[PDB]
Write a protein that binds this ligand. Structure first.
Ligand SMILES: Nc1nc2c(=O)n3cnc2n1[C@@H]1O[C@H](COP(=O)(O)OP(=O)(O)OC[C@H]2O[C@@H]3[C@H](O)[C@@H]2O)[C@@H](O)[C@H]1O
Length: 245
């Protein structure tokens, strides 16, 4: 193929449009959104543009339309453990991840790119962030929304981390390279990490100490908890202290 990454997801346009409709139906705060407009702004960011030359400015019309307030003190970040984060917030909406927002919901699990000097979508391949370029439509989208999500957070912010990874905290992740550096010291009191086990006290892991030290220097308190049994954890969230939770 031209590029090394997978092509635009089959039915991408129909899918984004349908997700926008469904989202705006469910969430009253976004009932004002015109979904065709959202789609046109989304398209505008990457159609007829070189897919290794995308900027955050390309996504500004979309950011504008998807403008949204979520409770700033109930934010859940995560790294390498998306599924658990999603299952947790779905129980009773204790917290909100980026996918609980319109823009995050539209884009989750999709890939897309265009081509320079033709107005079509590329269903054959899209740039891989490593081999091709990092300035590609998908990578640039997530960097942009994740920066914005972190900037809006306040009070106690939580992050779920995968304890089974080689680096439980990875400075190379979007959490580690973007979100950590965009939490606002004026607003964020504490970052609390939940390290999910797959054992030891993983909160004393070296990369966790690194995370602690980094956020301390931004003037933010750090807290850490082991979640030894994600299965029991979810059961306790669903059945709160009904049992021995
Ligand atoms: N679908 C999706 N939602 C995402 C999200 O909300 N965030 C980042 N990436 C996201 N993705 C895609 O999922 C893959 C894999 O992401 P990883 O497991 O390595 O974790 P990370 O890099 O630390 O990003 C998570 C972090 O940033 C925000 C979010 O708020 C969260 O706090 C990304 O490349 C992206 O294409």
């Amino acid at each position: 193929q031209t590029w090394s990454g997978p092509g635009t997801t089959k039915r991408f346009p129909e899918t984004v449009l349908a997700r926008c409709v469904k989202y705006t139906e469910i969430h009253p705060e976004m009932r004002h959104v015109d979904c065709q407009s959202v789609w046109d702004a989304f398209k505008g960011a990457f159609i007829s543009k070189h897919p290794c030359d995308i900027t955050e400015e390309d996504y500004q019309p979309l950011m504008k339309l998807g403008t949204q307030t979520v409770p700033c003190n109930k934010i859940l970040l995560w790294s390498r453990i998306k599924d658990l984060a999603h299952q947790f917030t779905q129980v009773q909406r204790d917290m909100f991840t980026l996918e609980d927002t319109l823009l995050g919901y539209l884009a989750d699990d999709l890939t897309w790119c265009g081509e320079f000097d033709t107005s079509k979508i590329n269903y054959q391949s899209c740039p891989d962030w490593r081999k091709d370029c990092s300035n590609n439509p998908v990578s640039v989208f997530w960097k942009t929304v994740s920066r914005r999500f972190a900037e809006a957070a306040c009070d106690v912010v939580h992050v779920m981390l995968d304890g089974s990874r080689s680096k439980i905290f990875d400075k190379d992740s979007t959490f580690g390279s973007v979100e950590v550096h965009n939490l606002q010291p004026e607003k964020v009191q504490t970052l609390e990490a939940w390290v999910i086990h797959g054992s030891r006290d993983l909160c004393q892991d070296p990369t966790i100490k690194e995370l602690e030290s980094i956020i301390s220097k931004r003037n933010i308190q750090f807290s850490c908890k082991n979640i030894y049994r994600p299965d029991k954890f979810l059961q306790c969230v669903k059945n709160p202290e009904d049992s021995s939770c």
